[PDB]
């Protein structure tokens, strides 16, 4: 149960988000849709308390900032340096970095989870490759594997299906269905309006305020899309 209460995010004397208030129930795969640059991506960052915000967000009657261990954030692969010297195996192991104490290190339990996460997304033989030596789809699957090892109850992805091949997209979606089957909640910021009823069981339309939110068939409608992409001036 994700619960947002009057969340707002300013930037340059301009509210990019204005009084966001939702109750998201799982298990679910929900799509956050709307115009590019219009607050759908910053909603995830406002929830986590990464950027400054003017409200509260909760996970099962506990504040989101005080319970970050229960949630995993898969950022856009566009703001990761591909030429950083790091292997696929090491990149996936970054998910377990909060779990280890200050003077301890990764035991066999942690490496077994790293091996299994790579095997799920189909990149076990790529474990020793540099991240620079991978396609967009393959690198996205490394980030999904890195997400899996956290063993979180909530998974927030920022445009996971943007600029990837179909084979990679098919694998990534099978992994998110596993997260839904396991009772967990998956909240995807989607990059366009492609395959909305195929991926998502609820949708959340965002231009600045939440213009619509609910079950996909009911809320992914021409009326709601018009005022989102038309800025209530269609």
């Amino acid at each position, epitope marked *: 149960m994700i619960r947002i209460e009057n969340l707002s995010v300013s930037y340059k004397e301009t509210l990019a988000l204005k009084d966001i208030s939702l109750v998201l129930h799982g298990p679910t795969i929900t799509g956050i849709i709307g115009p590019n640059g219009a607050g759908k991506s910053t909603l995830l960052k406002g929830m986590l308390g990464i950027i400054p915000h003017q409200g509260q967000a909760f996970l099962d009657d506990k504040e989101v900032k005080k319970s970050l261990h229960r949630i995993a954030y898969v950022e856009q692969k566009i703001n990761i340096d591909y030429n950083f010297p790091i292997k696929v195996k090491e990149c996936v192991s970054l998910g377990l970095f909060p779990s280890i104490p200050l003077f301890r290190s990764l035991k066999a*339990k942690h490496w077994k*989870k790293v091996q*299994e996460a790579l095997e*799920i*997304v189909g990149l076990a033989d790529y474990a020793e490759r540099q991240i620079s030596q991978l396609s967009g789809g393959q690198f996205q699957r490394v980030l999904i594997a890195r997400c899996l090892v956290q*063993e979180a109850d909530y998974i927030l992805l920022d445009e996971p299906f943007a600029g990837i091949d179909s084979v990679s997209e098919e694998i990534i979606m099978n992994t998110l269905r596993d997260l*839904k089957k*396991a009772g967990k909640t998956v909240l995807i910021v989607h990059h366009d309006l492609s395959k909305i009823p195929h991926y998502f069981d609820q949708v959340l339309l965002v231009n600045r305020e939440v213009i619509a939110f609910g079950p996909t068939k009911e809320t992914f409608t021409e009326t709601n899309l018009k005022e989102a992409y038309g800025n209530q001036l269609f």
Partner: antibody
Amino acid sequence: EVMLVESGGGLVKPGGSLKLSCAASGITFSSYAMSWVRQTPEKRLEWVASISSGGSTYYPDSVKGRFTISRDNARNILYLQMSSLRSEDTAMYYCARGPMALLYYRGFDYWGQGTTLTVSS
Amino acid sequence: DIVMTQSPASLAVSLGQRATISCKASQSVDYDGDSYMNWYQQKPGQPPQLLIYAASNLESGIPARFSGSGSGTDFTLNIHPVEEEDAATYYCQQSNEDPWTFGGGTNLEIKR
């Protein structure tokens, strides 16, 4: 719908061999740990074999030596070869997405409909 | 082996009331703060259906009326409120050590 379907069950005399198959739809077996679990006529669930994604198989001592679990990646079929079948092997044999260390896959979360095996003369 | 015995083996509960099923184990089912304990439901005809995995993690499709708890060797499966559709046999199971073992069985009768 994600679905597993077993086949190849039937009658075998004591000492005979039989090979069970498991077809998939929506799952690629190579990516997950896969297992076979049996249910006796007295409703006792017993695990009989598993195969990890890497290829490492492992079995219980009660079934070791006789049963061997394999997997065809290209056709995407999981098999269970049985040999020298004893009378205690009479059971409903299930195909299931087996146990793993990661939180979400710690149980048998998918189960096929089940193909039955009788071992009698 | 890790042997596990459920208690009780047969149970009768009326509608809207608490059902409770135990699963004691010979050895630890948890490993280093990670539970590998799992609960299943089996209605006749169909296979066993994963109900709850680890200690308390609820699989989707199963309503929140079901719940799991406990640690180490002692574990519990609660159902409240109990409804007509919950008539089935219930198994515990561990994925911590070889062989992967199941419980004996617990039949749930709904009163009428």
